[PDB]
Amino acid sequence: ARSTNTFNYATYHTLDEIYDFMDLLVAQHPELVSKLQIGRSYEGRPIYVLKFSTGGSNRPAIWIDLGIHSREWITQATGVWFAKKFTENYGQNPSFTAILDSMDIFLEIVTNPNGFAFTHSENRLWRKTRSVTSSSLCVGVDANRNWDAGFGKAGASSSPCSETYHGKYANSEVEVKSIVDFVKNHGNFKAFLSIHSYSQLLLYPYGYTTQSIPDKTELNQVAKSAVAALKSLYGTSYKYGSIITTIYQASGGSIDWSYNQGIKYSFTFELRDTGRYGFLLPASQIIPTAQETWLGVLTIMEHTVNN
């Protein structure tokens, strides 16, 4: 509430608290953390990115987004925890410190603010955006099927009323296009991590196609390493692989896009749990989730700094 050291990371928060949090952090670490507004949501809400940087030019950067699907509360929660952790770990952990001395981190805690607010206000299990309009009474797009990455192919629905609606055209959703522009403009993203829940997976491209990425040996071994790292804290067991092989065909995803932009280290996480609680993961599992998922993320970041 009054500082980041006072903020309760062991409970779920509303939009206002998370935004206020972003302010506390910037005020507390002005030299390390910048808050960027890369857009406005459908309903006019600021869309915020925290930039972690130790200086430099347009340093190679890591993208991390969380909460694109609004009901996956664990992701927005982890996202706050990560932001704190960056500020804590800088100069303490030799490994993290070497990362930030050379690379920037862009962290998007609430990718889908409208959906988030709606999860608090009306429907806890809402996952889409809240864009309206057309020949429908149904609101919102699945923002993780809206990307220009086999957009409108099988693995996404052309019904507005669908929970997996892909939207009218690739990048129709402002929450998406804001990221696109942002990353395309920067031009020096080396890794790109989208954070989801649940089912305990680490995935690399493709979803939309059976085609094997050229970098699959490398991405596989990376995925292996990060899953090993993650399981070291509490024993939490992930599976890993390409989306289409592990999960299902899915078109218009985050990772397919970024990898097609030449960002090689394009990974999606699906956090806890395995179905016991689902989207409604107990607040008592926030910190343990955040802590292990850090070890998984750190691993990738390290690989990245290294190649």
Ligand SMILES: [Zn+2]
């Ligand atoms: Zn999701």
